[PDB]
Subunit: 142 residues, 3 copies
């Protein structure tokens, strides 16, 4: 069968609407089958000295479904190789957000600056269900 | 209809029992409809010099349901604006925990101290299902 | 009843195949009933000066089920007491990965080195479902 047919085991898989605010970047994609995240691109060149942080545009906006959350995670390779991290990791993308996804990168290396180029894959976006809990206040209840 | 009626689409939404150990703080709340997290308050004033961390009381205890986990995430605005982060992010609140939720804040700015005041919203709490996995050890099995 | 019987409330609980690449370490375990994570051991001695990071072997490989993700989270006690963190937290373990789980530890204390010994519990592994989303590109759509 061709790929337009949804296989039985994927009947209930979730769709995510996405706008490329920067049409010159590829759509985010999973690096390998079954990978949890789609990789987000940087729309911009950024140089981070040790300890500096920047709010980096990804060129995309998404519509996370109600009842779900988008989560922006660092990539392990950049984290290990150069100390690149995300200040607010895991970044929380709410269902109602329609703005551009931005990544708060930070250089956690003590001495070597990190150069990010436009078109580099700088984070990964996961989508999960979340419990939109109803709080029940009690006076008292490992 | 009035708000006491659970709408059909919310019939299965999860309740979370909460004790305000500090009754002078508001209950945690979602900033907007559909937001993944409820914002946690600081019960205390804390000043963090660059690179310092503190274990900050939130004034609340919760009963995360069995089969779920509470997750303490940083807020993006403070992370970007002043470099505020959480050392153990995402903080993992277990179903059996009945103590006060505490937030391990850290100042990741190189030079500017962060002042947290009692009543500031310093983190956000998400609740998700988790797989309480049964390990199956094998000798061998992208 | 003896423990070999799956209780009714655990009928659908997920199994996780695991190989101890280092058979001298215990299998990861939950510290308490209902805890979200199983604690990962270090296979190695590592000393981290302030601001240094290391890619630490855990001695295990896992087979996260398709449709799920493994998540490597810091432990709160080490984070608060000595400033130990994980550069790429939450570390993302994909369903297709069959290599050794490695932990990117970092010392976020300003002045005191952290010593990790072989056999110390240095992180915790959670397993959750993830939405393997199908992107739907649109021109336009808190
Ligand atoms: O903490 C971690 C994170 C990942 N990993 C392994 C398993 C995971 O499936 C794999 C890739 O993780 P990332 O996608 O975060 N890394 P990166 O994107 O740099 O590499 P790749 O191009 O292979 O996806 O690395 C660890 O061992 N520990
Ligand atoms: O990494 C991130 C995190 C959040 N965001 C966007 C989407 C999310 O819905 C929105 C708000 O996230 P937070 O709740 O973490 N930020 P904060 O609480 O400071 O702002 P708000 O008062 O708007 O909730 O910011 C990003 O673009 N990148
Ligand atoms: O951010 C956090 C994380 C945890 N906690 C509490 C609730 C959680 O169930 C408990 C234990 O969390 P960890 O397992 O991350 N800590 P650690 O493994 O050091 O302690 P323990 O041996 O008790 O599990 O600490 C907080 O109050 N805030
Ligand atoms: Mg990857
Ligand atoms: Mg918010
Ligand atoms: Mg623990």
């Amino acid at each position: 069968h061709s790929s337009g047919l949804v296989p039985r085991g994927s009947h209930m898989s979730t769709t995510l609407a996405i706008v490329r605010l920067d049409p010159g970047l590829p759509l985010p994609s999973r690096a390998h089958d079954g990978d949890a995240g789609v990789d987000l691109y940087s729309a911009e060149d950024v140089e981070l000295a040790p300890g500096r942080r920047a709010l980096v545009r990804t060129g995309v906006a998404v519509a996370v479904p109600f009842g779900m959350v988008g989560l922006v995670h660092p990539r392990s390779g950049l984290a290990t190789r150069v100390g690149l991290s995300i200040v607010n990791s895991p970044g929380t993308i709410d269902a109602g957000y329609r703005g551009e996804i931005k990544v708060a990168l930070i250089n956690l290396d003590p001495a070597a600056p990190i150069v990010v180029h436009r078109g580099d894959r700088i984070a990964q976006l996961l989508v999960q269900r979340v419990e939109l809990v109803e709080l029940v206040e009690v006076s008292s209840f490992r």
